[PDB]
Design a protein around this ligand. Structure first.
Ligand SMILES: N[C@@H](Cc1c[nH]c2ccccc12)C(=O)O
Ligand SMILES: CC(C)=CCSP(=O)(O)OP(=O)(O)O
Length: 356
C-alpha cells in the first residue's frame, strides 16, 4: 500500500523537474519534516487535524514566480509528535529545524532572542510552530519559522507581538501598523495576529513577516490596512482581489490575509503581500487556474510554468474538485516581488466542486 511519503515525495520529485531543481536535498528535507507521518499508510486517516491544509495533509506546496530568477519551490509543513498534540508537534518540528540548523551551520540568535516570548505549557490554536523549506534556483535550501502569536490566547497576542518586534529593534515601526493599519479596535477580533515569521538564520538585519487575518473583510478595509506600507497602490491590491475573488467585494468565505515585512531603520513595514484563499471563491480548480493564469498574464509571467506545476502535483481533471489551488498571493517591495500559487497535496481528500 502507498504511504504518505510515497504520495508527497512523488509530488515533490515531479515539481523539482518543473522548477529544474536537483531533487536529492529537497526530498531528504521533506522526509525529515514529515517525521513519523512519512511511513504511515495513505489509507490511514490523518493522525492530527493539521491546520496546514483543508484535508489535514501536514504539508502544502507553493511556486513563487520572480521577476529576475526562475520560480522558487517551497514546502510549508509541520512534524507531528508520537502521539500528536500541540506541544508534541511543536517539540518534533523544533527538533527537525534545530537538527537542520546544526547541519547547515546556521546561527539562530534572532529566533532564540524571541523564542521565550512564545513558550507556554498550554499552547492554544492547534499550532505553535510551522516551517517553510525554500528551494531557490541553483541555491542551497533556506528555512523559515512561523510562530503563532495567539499561542497564549488571542487577548495576549498584541502584547506578545509588540515585545517580540521590540527585541529585534522594530518597536518603532510596529506602532505604525497598529496605530494607522488596523481597523479601529478590531485588533484580536476582526484583525487577528495569525503568523510571526523569521528566516531561521539570523542574517545581516533583523526577513519579521507579521501576517494579519482580516475576517469578513471589505477590500476597502484590507487596502486601507495595506496603505501604511509606502508605494503600495490600493487600486492594484483591489484589482488582484476582484480578479482572484471573481467579483467578491466582501470576503465572507475564507478570509483575506495581509503580511507586513518589518525591517531595521524603517518607520513602517517595507514589504506588503496579500493572500487570497481563491479556493473559497471558485466553482472548481479549472476556474481557479483560469483566474491565476489571468493574473500571471497581466504581470507578464509565463502560464506554462503554472500548468506544468499543477500537472506535477495531480493528474485529476481540474473540474473534478476545488482547493488544489488553495491560495494565490501578490508580493510587493523588497526583497523579491511577484505572484505565488499555493498547491494542495490532497493526500486525504479532494474537496468537491460546486456546480456550473
Ligand atoms: N491552510 C491554512 C494555513 C495556510 C496555508 N497556506 C496559507 C497561505 C496563506 C495564508 C494561510 C495559509 C489556511 O488556509 O488558513
Ligand atoms: C502565512 C502562510 C502560512 C503562508 C504564506 S507566507 P510564504 O512563506 O508561503 O511566502 P513568502 O514569505 O511570501 O515568500
Amino acid at each position: 500500500g502507498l504511504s504518505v511519503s510515497d504520495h508527497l515525495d512523488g509530488q515533490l520529485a515531479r515539481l523539482c523537474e518543473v522548477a529544474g531543481a536537483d531533487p536529492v536535498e529537497p526530498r531528504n528535507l521533506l522526509a525529515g519534516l514529515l517525521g513519523p507521518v512519512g511511513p504511515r499508510p495513505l489509507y490511514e486517516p490523518p493522525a492530527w487535524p493539521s491546520g496546514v491544509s483543508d484535508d489535514h495533509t501536514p504539508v502544502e506546496f507553493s511556486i513563487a514566480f520572480n521577476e529576475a530568477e526562475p520560480p522558487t519551490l517551497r514546502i510549508l509543513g509541520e512534524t507531528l509528535g508520537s502521539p500528536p498534540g500541540p506541544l508534541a508537534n511543536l517539540s518534533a518540528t523544533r527538533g527537525f529545524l534545530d537538527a537542520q540548523a546544526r547541519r547547515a551551520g546556521l546561527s539562530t540568535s534572532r529566533l532564540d532572542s524571541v523564542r521565550d516570548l512564545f513558550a507556554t505549557d498550554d499552547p492554544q490554536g492547534d499550532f505553535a510552530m510551522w516551517c517553510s523549506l525554500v528551494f531557490r534556483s541553483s541555491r542551497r535550501p533556506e528555512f523559515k519559522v512561523y510562530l503563532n502569536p495567539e499561542v497564549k490566547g488571542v487577548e495576549r497576542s498584541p502584547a506578545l507581538v509588540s515585545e517580540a518586534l521590540h527585541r529585534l529593534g522594530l518597536g518603532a515601526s510596529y506602532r505604525a501598523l497598529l496605530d494607522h493599519g488596523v481597523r479601529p479596535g478590531e485588533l484580536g477580533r476582526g484583525d487577528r495576529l495569525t503568523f510571526f515569521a523569521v528566516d531561521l538564520h539570523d542574517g545581516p538585519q533583523a526577513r519579521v513577516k507579521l501576517y494579519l487575518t482580516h475576517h469578513e473583510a471589505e477590500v476597502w478595509d484590507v487596502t486601507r490596512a495595506a496603505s501604511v506600507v509606502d508605494g503600495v497602490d490600493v487600486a492594484e491590491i483591489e484589482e488582484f482581489c476582484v480578479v482572484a475573488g471573481g467579483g467578491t467585494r466582501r470576503f465572507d468565505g475564507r478570509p483575506l490575509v495581509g503580511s507586513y515585512t518589518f525591517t531595521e531603520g524603517a518607520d513602517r513595514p517595507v514589504g506588503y503581500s496579500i493572500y487570497v484563499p481563491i479556493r473559497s471563491y471558485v466553482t472548481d480548480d479549472q476556474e481557479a487556474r483560469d483566474r491565476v493564469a489571468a493574473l500571471l498574464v497581466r504581470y507578464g509571467f509565463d502560464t506554462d510554468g503554472l500548468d506544468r506545476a499543477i500537472a506535477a502535483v495531480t493528474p485529476r481533471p481540474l473540474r473534478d474538485g476545488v482547493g488544489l489551488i488553495a491560495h494565490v498571493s501578490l508580493r510587493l517591495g523588497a526583497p523579491r516581488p511577484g505572484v505565488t500559487v499555493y498547491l494542495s497535496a490532497e493526500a486525504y481528500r479532494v474537496s468537491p466542486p460546486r456546480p456550473r
